[model samples]
Target: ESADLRALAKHLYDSYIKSFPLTKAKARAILTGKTTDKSPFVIYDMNSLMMGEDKIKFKHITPLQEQSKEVAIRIFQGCQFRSVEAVQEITEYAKSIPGFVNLDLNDQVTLLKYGVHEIIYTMLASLMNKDGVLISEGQGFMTREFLKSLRKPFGDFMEPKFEFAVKFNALELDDSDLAIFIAVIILSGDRPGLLNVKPIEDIQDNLLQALELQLKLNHPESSQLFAKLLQKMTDLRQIVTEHVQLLQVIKKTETDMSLHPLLQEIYK
Candidate 1:
């Protein structure tokens, strides 16, 4: 298990570093024991560091010359994602747990959160796999083939209903807010488990309400907000389609050929 985990960890780390070349050299130095410290740290570009203009703070900080160290701190704090092995470990632990049906509501919610977090991490890591393929040069750490190899296992593990709910929640926030939420979810919940069964319709309605709030405010960026909301709506529609398809497949498989008498009466 240790060997397998270490291999997975190393692969994930290499993939991450390869996508971000500046970070790759730093990571390689650390991995090769050329660096003294084992504690994890992110390396920032000198210009980005000086201007405090990393991805997280790009929106908040104005004036390149006046940017402060605080911005860099915010960027680092906001943008971090769970390491691949960490997510895998949490997922494995969740799968090993027993009796989801017997757990109390709070425990069930906790378990659900863990499951959702795992899916989110996996999705982001998948996105980063694309990044690694596009950005890295020559025998890249995470090749396109390697990334493709990961997809089947990752997709098989994701429960469709749970994934839809988690993705809906993730899309509820703005990009920055979503990033922060992802970081927090990763920190708090990454294990395999079932969430309490909440009404999906209720969750969808709440998201609609949030969208309405943004619309009512007539913010300067209302168009962008609406665009994002529409994109999410489209995604939800796709989920619904998949759900229907699954039902169709199941119905086709079932041996019961007779439509219940109630079905004819209900239609009439």
Candidate 2:
């Protein structure tokens, strides 16, 4: 049983990190509260309303000024689709768990639809560093500054999310813990619209039990870490709500750039 548990632990780490290799290993600074070095991009009073002597109006986005924003949005759409794909991978995984598929088909679909974006961010938070997500298969890095600099609705959605990620990352959980944590997030039947929750919650409880076991073995002295990780779930849920709202708002800008279709369904 213990050996199987260790293998489960290794699988979880491999699954998530392999799924998002760009972001997998980079963000430990957020976990430990280490300040990252001077980033590749720049930051400014981009948030301030007061005009500077350079007379940058700070309102409109010229295409040149917005090149990064454009690229960012493109990446956003791509990654959102990637998240949807990630959820599908999770769905495949859940199938291996007993009775996950026995829940009413509609209920299973509903949980995936409503819960996946939330799950996506939950995993994403695990990947985030103090700087931002790693992109372009590691050749490119998106600084937190660049994501924050995107225009209104995108800005609204992103900034608050990074703040949440930073705080959650501060929990300093290792991959084994995060693996268990993501399981608990996805298996949750407590999400508002779920109908056949008991079956689903049963899976979550099983995962939760497994999580407690892992915590016990992994952090023998830190009794509080398990509870703290659960509390972080509360935080993840709130940010997930905000993340969905942001996607919904950004949906209205479809003409500017089309959102990935899978994400469209998730956001809708």
Candidate 3:
């Protein structure tokens, strides 16, 4: 029984973390400034990136005007870049899952549309701690205070992620555990437009079982942590809801900023 679960777990592990570019180990090295690699673009610290009085700071983000608009555009565009990569990576992983590719094409799209954010948020723990997330995949680091300084919806967006990352990190899940977790998120039967819900649920149940076995091996004494993580899934949905709302606000106000086609679809 455990052998089959282990096989499922290994299948997920190879599909996700094995091919991931920014693994937890690499992210930690970059975050701690242990990496020798140089950023191709100039690193921008929100603190040093702006100048002038508090009132006029809105106009003084150095490289652009309308501070919030400009900074938000840059930040969102960066997110889009990462999101595009995540979508591709996640799609490949989804295809590797036993039952995922057999779904209706629309169901496949719907699962990805909803699941990508959860997967992205889950993987974000690699590049983040409570203080901030590493940008450009180790090329830059942005501080939490810096993100909080952005106007309205922009600043409001990251606080919850940082809060969640801090708590989620406490679980100390390794790449293998995260692989099963990502599989669980993608195979969720409750996604709004799923066509073959029973199959999806069956796939998810297998992943969940694999997850339980893996977690037990990894965190021997913490039996309740599995339930705690399931709660985090609910928490992830709430955060994504707020994220979509803020993106709407951003879309309305920042008309000049263009979202990538992939991101545009997901947002809609």
Candidate 4:
């Protein structure tokens, strides 16, 4: 059993470590606003253009004022671009898991569909803090306050995610732990539309047991940390449900904005 767990951990580390984003040194630099580089394509602001700004009157809009729909769409699009990149990385990681590819092709798609959002949120912990998440490869910071100022569906979607991220970050998990956790999420037997339950359950049980052992080895004194992480996964699932609801809302109202093809399919 011990050798099995060690082997499982090795496979997970080899598969997931390569795709994990950002080192602690790099994450700290971005979080501290010390990074000198920038990603010009990403819209870092809620109102980057002059759409809502008019200086002549005292009523002239500031950053906190009503957000323009164009700005909102651009930001959403930028985020979509980033999200699409994540899908590829996550798909690669999922395929590398020991038994993932052996599942039915349709079941593989089903798992990815249902599990991607939760995994994304899990990985986002690396780039997130109490204030907001880093965007554009850590080239920009989007504060919670600024996101909350956007109108309609846009404003409503992020608060729950921010809430989840803040608490998850408190756990201070590193990349290897995250790799195993994300594998467990993808292997979840509970996701809707799963056709082969037994195999997935078998895979998930092994992964979960491996994760508990890994946690024990990593954080020797923290007896309850494994349970806390499980609860956090549950919290992330709720966040994804809310996120999809809001995305549907965005699709209905924000007719002008477009989602990436993969995103469009996943959100539907």
Per-candidate clash tally: 3, 1, 0, 0
Q: How do all models score by TM-score?
A: 0.26, 0.70, 0.84, 0.81
Model 3: lowest-lDDT 10 consecutive positions: 52-61
Candidate lDDT scores, in order, read 0.36, 0.62, 0.76, 0.74
- Span of ten consecutive residues with least summed lDDT in model 1: 131-140
| lDDT string, candidate 3, 1-268, tens digits | 8999999988888777655888887787666555657532223355444432132212212454553356656666557666777778889988998888888899999999889988888888788877777766555567777786776667778888888888888888888888888889999888886777988898899899999999988889997878988888877888888888887787677455365466456534
lDDT of 2 by residue, 1-268 (tens): 5666566666666665654443434545422345465332222344321122124322223324233545346535756655655766777655544566788877777767666766677767765666676433332345677678766667566777778777877765676677667767767776667778777887787677777878888888876778887887667678877766676776576555464465456633
Alpha-carbon RMSD, candidate 1: 21.5
Q: Flag the better candidate by lDDT, 2 or 3.
A: 3
Q: Which candidate comes out best when scored by TM-score?
A: 3
Q: Best candidate, lDDT-wise?
A: 3
Please rank every candidate by TM-score, starting with the best: 3, 4, 2, 1
lDDT of 4: 0.74
Off by over 4 Å in 1: 1-141, 149-175, 179-268
- Give every collision pair in model 2: 27-129
Residue 95 of model 2: what lDDT? 55
Backbone collision tally, model 2: 1
Determine the C-alpha RMSD for candidate 2 after optimal superposition of all C-alphas.
7.3
Better of 1 and 3 by TM-score: 3
Ranking by lDDT: 3, 4, 2, 1
